[PDB]
Structures are given as C-alpha cells and as structure tokens.
Design a protein around this ligand. Sequence first.
Ligand SMILES: Cc1ccc2c(c1)c(-c1ccc(C(=O)O)cc1OCc1ccccc1)nn2C(=O)c1c(Cl)cccc1C(F)(F)F
Ligand SMILES: Cc1ccc2c(c1)c(-c1ccc(C(=O)O)cc1OCc1ccccc1)nn2C(=O)c1c(Cl)cccc1C(F)(F)F
Lengths: 263, 258
Amino acid sequence: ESADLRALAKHLYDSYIKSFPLTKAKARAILTGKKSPFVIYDMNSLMMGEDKIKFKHITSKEVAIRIFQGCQFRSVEAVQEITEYAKSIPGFVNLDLNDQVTLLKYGVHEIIYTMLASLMNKDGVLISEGQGFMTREFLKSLRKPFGDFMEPKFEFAVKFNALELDDSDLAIFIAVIILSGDRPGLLNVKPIEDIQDNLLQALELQLKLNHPESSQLFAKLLQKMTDLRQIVTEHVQLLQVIKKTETDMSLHPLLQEIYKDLY
Amino acid sequence: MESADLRALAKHLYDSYIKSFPLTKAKARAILTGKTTDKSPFVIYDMNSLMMGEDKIEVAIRIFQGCQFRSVEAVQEITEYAKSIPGFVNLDLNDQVTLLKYGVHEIIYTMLASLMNKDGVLISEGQGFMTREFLKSLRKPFGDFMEPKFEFAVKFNALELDDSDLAIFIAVIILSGDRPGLLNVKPIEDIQDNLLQALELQLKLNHPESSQLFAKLLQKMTDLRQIVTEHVQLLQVIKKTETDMSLHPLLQEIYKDL
Ligand SMILES: Cc1ccc2c(c1)c(-c1ccc(C(=O)O)cc1OCc1ccccc1)nn2C(=O)c1c(Cl)cccc1C(F)(F)F
Ligand SMILES: Cc1ccc2c(c1)c(-c1ccc(C(=O)O)cc1OCc1ccccc1)nn2C(=O)c1c(Cl)cccc1C(F)(F)F
C-alpha cells in the first residue's frame, strides 16, 4: 500500500496548492530575499502602506486595535480556505454533517497557527499574499495587551519552522489535525479515526522519503500538537481579557456576527 | 539505531521499571479482574467502610493527604527510574532537575491509570480499592479534583499498554527537550530519539495488529500536558481555601513556578 499512501500525499498536496493563496515555498523566497514587499516597521510606514497597497480590512481609529482586527479579518478568510481544503480529504465529505462542522470548529485554530508559521520568520510576517511584511518589533511594541498578544505567535513559529517542513509535508499534517477523533460532541468517532490512521501512515512515509536524514521527525512533528493545543488555550484566555478590558473594540453588530467564532 | 540495540534498550528499561516501581500494571490487573482468593482488596465505598478499612489494612482532607503521600513516594520512584535511563545522569545537573520537575506529574498521571478502572482505584499497594463514586462525592473542591484522574485513565487504558510498553513511554516523557529553562537541548533530544526508536519497535512487535499505536500514544502526551496544567491550577485554588493542607517539601518545590 506504499503507492496508495503516495497517491494520498500527492492528492492532498495538489489540493493544498489550490486552496491556499501563498505557499510556504513562495513565502520563504520572499522572506529570504530570493517583487520586493512593502515593509511596515512603524506608524508612518503603516499609514503609507494602507495608502499605497490598500491592505483590506479598514472600516476605532487606534492603530493597535486596527492591527488586531486585521488579524481577525484574515483568520476568517483562512477558516473558509481550510473548510474548502477539508472537503478534498478522502472520506471527509462522507462523514455525518454535524461531525464535519465539529471537526472544523475545533481544528481551525490549530491549523491557522500552523500555517501562520509558514509566513513568519524571527523578524516578521508576510501579509496580503506576500505583498507586505510587518516587523515583529513593531507588532510587539503595540500597547497594552496587544503587543503581548502578537509576540507568542512568533515564539511558536520560530520553533515550528526549525523542523523545516515543506508544503507537501504540511498538506498531510493539516489533514491529521482536522481528523481528530477526540473533539467534543463527535457522534461517530470510528470513521474519523480510520481516516486519521490513513493520514498518519501517509505522513510517516512522506517524512521518511522527504527528510531521510531527519531522525524521528514524525515523532517530533506529533509532539508539536502539544504546543498547538497549549497556545490555542492561551489564545482564548488572552482574547477574554481583551474583551473584558477594551471598550473601544466596537464594530457594527453584523461584523461582530461575522467574527463570532474568533472573538 | 539498529534493531538488536533497540531491543536491548527496551529490556534494560523494562527491567529497571520493575525494580523501581512497587506495583506493576500486571499486578494491578490481576487484582482488579479478580478470580483469586489471595489478592482480593478491601473495598472503600463510604464512610463506614473507610473506618473499617483503616482497622483492616476530616475525611476529604485525609483522603487528599493519602493521594499526596503516594504522589511523593511516586516522585522518589520516578527519580530512581530516571537515573537508570542511559545518558540521563551524564546530563548537566540543572537539566536533570528541570526534566524531573516538569516530567513527574505527567508520569504520575500515566502510571495512576495502571491502578484504575472505571469503578475505582487501587490503594495501599493493592490491598485496598476505593470507589470512584465515593471519591467524586467528597465535598467542596475535593470531589471534582479526584474525578479528572479517572476520566484520563479510562481513555489511556483503552490503548491496552503493558508494563514493557510503559517503561519506554515514561522514559520518552522524561527526556523532553522542550521543557522551560533547559540549558543543553541537543543531548536531551539525542537520548529521546533513541527512546522513540525503541518505543516504535516495541509497539510494532508487541501490538502488531494495533495500527499507528505509536502515533496514538504520542497524541496522549498532549492530553497529559493539558491535564497537568488544569491540575496545578485547581491545586492552587484549593491551597488558598484550605489551611489544613500541608504539601511535602518535595512537591512544594516542584510546584514553585509550576
Ligand atoms: C502577527 C499575527 C498575530 C496574530 C494573528 C495573526 C498574525 C493571524 C494570521 C493568521 C493567518 C494568516 C494567513 O495569512 O494565513 C495571517 C495572519 O495575520 C496576518 C496579519 C498580520 C498583521 C496584521 C494584519 C494581518 N492570526 N492571528 C491570530 O491572533 C489568530 C490566530 Cl494565530 C489563530 C486563530 C485566530 C486568530 C485571531 F482571530 F484572533 F486573529
Ligand atoms: C484517585 C486519585 C486522585 C488524585 C490523586 C491520586 C489519586 C494520586 C495518586 C497518585 C499516584 C498513586 C500511586 O500509587 O502511584 C496513587 C495515588 O492516589 C492513591 C490514593 C487514592 C485514594 C486515596 C488515597 C490514596 N495523586 N493524586 C493527586 O491529586 C496528585 C497527583 Cl495525580 C500528582 C501529583 C500530586 C498529587 C497531589 F499531591 F495533589 F495529591
């Protein structure tokens, strides 16, 4: 069944390229300087950037809040990209509909963190499909809770990126996260774990072929699921503090409804 | 890196685990499944049976201090086991402390599952059994402090690991290079890689019909991280209400900075 696992890997890779706007391969070429992105490193350059590139999300006048909301806006788009990707995972669309919704609902946060790392290095993050680059130092220097909200994402990414996965590896890894049988409220766990078993087999073979010199990479990647679960838990606690503290967060009730899953 | 060496390592750890830990899973299962007159536990299911049990072998506090006493002993046993893990004692001394400090709680949960089924837990080296319903009915924060241990154990025990599997699994946990404050991660990760290879082959040989058991076991390391986090929090909240609780200096130290 090696050929079947390879077939599965290729299927997911092809779908991953169609679903997501910027691949890790492209993001690394931009970050390493190999079409030069506009750089946001302070308030003035932010203002010029939104006037020149017109980074979508601009509707509170306060910068820190506008950047925070920009993150939420992009994460809503990512949810729809991940949802579409999921539909391409063999067996997924055949699951109970309620279980499809549960899997996506409890998976998307972990997947967004994972894929965010593809767009990050130790110095900052790509935005607008790699047309902009916003510096870590600028994000961290935002006031109040906002600075401290941004920095944990970079800390995770720097560590995740040390595994040096590529898109073909990530396509399978993301699938493994979606098909987690331990999500709350699942109706029929067995078929979910059967599909995950296939994906885990596929990921194992993919990592042995693609990184033969990298010993126990499979195991190291699964251990990252521990850091993912933890940071998502922290994320929720940080969001709640912000919600209780900040009165100037007010959007139109219809935007709030659009963002309800993320805020 | 070569099979025969991986099997040699599995045997080494299993042998050391038997020496370090008084009550194996194999012994616990023979007691729990019964059909043996000699090994039958006295069962504590209420206040009266507790009173008779002390003659034979505040309530919530006494039970709590029972759990705490055993946990301290477990730390001691785990520490002794850790020294047998090849390479561990050769590490920087600060890193040895750090690995134990963050590792013991995860191991205690894991090994406590060996002593549990869905109806209760073995105590007093298997001479006693205390019911889950009795523990959960303890007052105040204490009831809800007991129950999560059982909820984990029921799930972990579904994997049907035996002691030879657990010996390697526990060693993997201890040699975690992602602990906070580690000075030299590389030598830790080198040992862990060896243990992971040993675990993978152990599981393939011992559970050949159990697909991706390796991966499913590593996924349990995630559940451990979260439950230990919740444990610490709940223990802190209890500390602030209850002055009638003392923690052994060893546990006290482990909890300082979590
Ligand atoms: C720097 C940072 C911090 C928190 C962050 C994020 C980035 C992002 C984010 C995620 C996915 C992409 C993607 O292109 O694939 C892009 C993202 O930012 C782009 C961005 C950066 C700066 C200003 C505007 C827009 N999300 N985010 C979150 O806080 C977040 C995360 Cl990691 C997961 C789930 C939900 C959220 C959020 F909704 F609360 F934002
Ligand atoms: C059921 C339960 C709940 C919380 C628990 C525990 C059990 C235990 C515990 C752990 C290891 C053994 C071991 O034989 O190997 C035994 C243990 O109980 C035995 C026991 C049960 C009932 C009455 C008296 C004694 N500890 N425990 C804790 O709350 C605990 C844990 Cl899991 C880890 C560290 C510290 C603690 C404690 F200090 F807070 F107790």
